[PDB]
Amino acid sequence: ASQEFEVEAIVDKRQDKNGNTQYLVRWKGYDKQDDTWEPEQHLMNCEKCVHDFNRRQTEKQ
């Protein structure tokens, strides 16, 4: 997919007014200035990136 890029990490999340999630994506090989907020449907090929973010929520760093 031409718009499917490798994720370094998800580093934040938020809820929209529909109760759906958006994720703050750090893109592999890009700098912080290139981070984006992505709707959850964009993370369908990143289930591990979500599970890893969720695990890191429970740890210190």
Partner: peptide
């Protein structure tokens, strides 16, 4: 590429 973990990026 370091992993198979990809997501659609918003332009």
């Amino acid at each position: 590429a370091r992993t198979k973990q990809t997501a659609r990026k918003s332009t």
